[PDB]
Amino acid sequence: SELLKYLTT
Amino acid sequence: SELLKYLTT
Amino acid sequence: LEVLFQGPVNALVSHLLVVEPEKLYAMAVATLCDLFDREIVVTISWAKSIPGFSSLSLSDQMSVLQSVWMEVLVLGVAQRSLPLQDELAFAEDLVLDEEGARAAGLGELGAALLQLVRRLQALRLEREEYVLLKALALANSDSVHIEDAEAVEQLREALHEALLEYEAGRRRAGRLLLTLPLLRQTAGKVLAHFYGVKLEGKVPMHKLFLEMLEA
Amino acid sequence: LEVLFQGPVNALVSHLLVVEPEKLYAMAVATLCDLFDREIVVTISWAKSIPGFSSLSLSDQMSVLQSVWMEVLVLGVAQRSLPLQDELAFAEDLVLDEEGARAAGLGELGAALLQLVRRLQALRLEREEYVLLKALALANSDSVHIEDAEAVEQLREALHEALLEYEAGRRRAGRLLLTLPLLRQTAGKVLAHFYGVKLEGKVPMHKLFLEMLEA
């Protein structure tokens, strides 16, 4: 989730 | 120690 | 990026050297929590520059990262500490001996970390070898949550092949691979220690760091 | 025995096949404790038949064994479970699915073990490859208590070389080595579970098994 946000940046 | 006994058998 | 697997390996290796994350400063258990949180961010964008990684489904990118992130952080501390003796370079401004590390609330972690460092020192690891090894550890994940096992295996294989191709420019690759079991055990010790810190609830930790500890 | 490193590798490999321990019967957490105690005994005499091992100082033989014994036991369960599906062959008369293993008081260990088993299944490990890999895991110990690091490294190297020589009769060895990190993590999970059983104090355990858990 936080991880999803940095991955899909 | 038990280990020493089986190693030195 | 995937074309780097198709040409000669020197191009791949130079790419991995170029995307190596830059030195981090830390500004004493709360220091490491802050530093580790920031290295996760850096690690995420690093992963994205690994050829093949971004071709995995997002949820598999997620699973890999959340199972290897600490292995990558720990391997970075190790490369930075290779030229030193009985000291661990956590950052440009945070070098710590075993005593220094008890005092920053790390318990026996300093000893565990120096065991890895000595094992890599014995090899005289080159910088080229390190970035291929680091990429290979990413790709050797073993998450229970991986969906396309075949895709992760295929990326693992290309990175392994790159290491082989690199070493042939010839038992040396295997010697490198035989330090991975220790890298993974050491990382799991670091994880267990900081998960213990989570439970105490004294030290505040940022969102991303908590999320990765839960996983 | 050391002469097996000097001739052709087929002789070494046949020696390792001949000294493979025979099938063990188990006669339900106390069952595994009994079985694991007996497999330590078997493992000790197995180690002694590994060329080079007996040339280590006794105290280093001790350190190696007390840091890898569970890796060898776990790798034996894995080879025995390779032809099966979602089942773990702990013994000739003790095969267990994930449910069966919760019931024998193993918690999540069945899942951990099957993760290793699937990773080796993907490789289609041969019997020859397994005994070289098992010997190599012994020699890849990383005990903190090792005195002559150079001697352990030298034995590691010969066994690694044997695997290479074997595979050349050529990325295949490395693929094998990349399952070692998971083998060691899995073994450490099994250890942690049975150390927890020690503390409860319900289940009685034999001397040797307790001694190896303490170490």
From Swiss-Prot, chains A, B:
Q: What induces it?
A: Transcription is repressed by ZNF746 which binds to 'insulin response sequences' its promoter.
User: Could you say which tissues express the protein in this record?
Assistant: Heart, skeletal muscle, liver and kidney. Expressed at lower levels in brain and pancreas and at very low levels in the intestine and white adipose tissue. In skeletal muscle, levels were lower in obese than in lean subjects and fasting induced a 2-fold increase in levels in the skeletal muscle in obese subjects.
Which modifications occur after translation, per UniProt? Answer: Phosphorylation by AMPK in skeletal muscle increases activation of its own promoter. Phosphorylated by CLK2. Heavily acetylated by KAT2A/GCN5 under conditions of high nutrients, leading to inactivation of PPARGC1A. Deacetylated by SIRT1 in low nutrients/high NAD conditions, leading to its activation.
Domain of life of the native organism: Eukaryota
Subunit: Homooligomer. Interacts with MYBBP1A; inhibits MYBBP1A transcriptional activation. Interacts with PRDM16, LPIN1 and PML. Interacts (via LXXLL motif) with RORA and RORC (via AF-2 motif); activates RORA and RORC transcriptional activation. Interacts with LRPPRC. Interacts with FOXO1. Interacts with NR5A2.
Q: What does this protein do?
A: Transcriptional coactivator for steroid receptors and nuclear receptors. Greatly increases the transcriptional activity of PPARG and thyroid hormone receptor on the uncoupling protein promoter. Can regulate key mitochondrial genes that contribute to the program of adaptive thermogenesis. Plays an essential role in metabolic reprogramming in response to dietary availability through coordination of the expression of a wide array of genes involved in glucose and fatty acid metabolism.
* This protein's name: Peroxisome proliferator-activated receptor gamma coactivator 1-alpha
Q: Which organism is it from?
A: Homo sapiens
Q: What is the lineage of its organism?
A: Eukaryota, Metazoa, Chordata, Craniata, Vertebrata
Q: Which gene encodes it?
A: PPARGC1A
- Span within the full-length protein is 208 to 216 of 798
From Swiss-Prot, chains C, D:
| Swiss-Prot/TrEMBL induction comment | Induced by PGC1alpha in a number of specific cell types including heart, kidney and muscle.
Superkingdom field: Eukaryota
What does the UniProt keyword field contain? Acetylation, Cytoplasm, DNA-binding, Isopeptide bond, Metal-binding, Nucleus, Phosphoprotein, Receptor, Transcription, Transcription regulation, Ubl conjugation, Zinc, Zinc-finger
Q: Where in the cell is it found?
A: Nucleus; Cytoplasm
Effect recorded for R119A: Almost complete loss of interaction to L2 or to L3 of PPARGC1A
Post-translational modification as stated in the protein's UniProt record: Sumoylated with SUMO2. Sumoylation enhances repression of transcriptional activity, but has no effect on subcellular location nor on DNA binding.
Mutation effect (L213A)? Loss of coactivation activity. Loss of increased response to coactivator activity
- The UniProt record lists the Glycyl lysine isopeptide (Lys-Gly) (interchain with G-Cter in SUMO2) crosslink at K198
Q: Any idea where the NR LBD domain is? A: 9-215
**Subunit and interaction comment:** Binds DNA as a monomer or a homodimer. Interacts (via the AF2 domain) with coactivator PPARGC1A (via the L3 motif); the interaction greatly enhances transcriptional activity of genes involved in energy metabolism. Interacts with PIAS4; the interaction enhances sumoylation. Interacts with MAPK15; promotes re-localization of ESRRA to the cytoplasm through a XPO1-dependent mechanism then inhibits ESRRA transcriptional activity.
Q: Which family does it belong to?
A: Belongs to the nuclear hormone receptor family. NR3 subfamily.
Task: Tell me the function of this protein.
Answer: Binds to an ERR-alpha response element (ERRE) containing a single consensus half-site, 5'-TNAAGGTCA-3'. Can bind to the medium-chain acyl coenzyme A dehydrogenase (MCAD) response element NRRE-1 and may act as an important regulator of MCAD promoter. Binds to the C1 region of the lactoferrin gene promoter. Requires dimerization and the coactivator, PGC-1A, for full activity. The ERRalpha/PGC1alpha complex is a regulator of energy metabolism. Induces the expression of PERM1 in the skeletal muscle.
Q: What is this protein called?
A: Steroid hormone receptor ERR1
The upper taxonomy is: Eukaryota, Metazoa, Chordata, Craniata, Vertebrata
Write the gene name. Answer: ESRRA
Residues of the whole record sequence present:
194 to 420 of 423
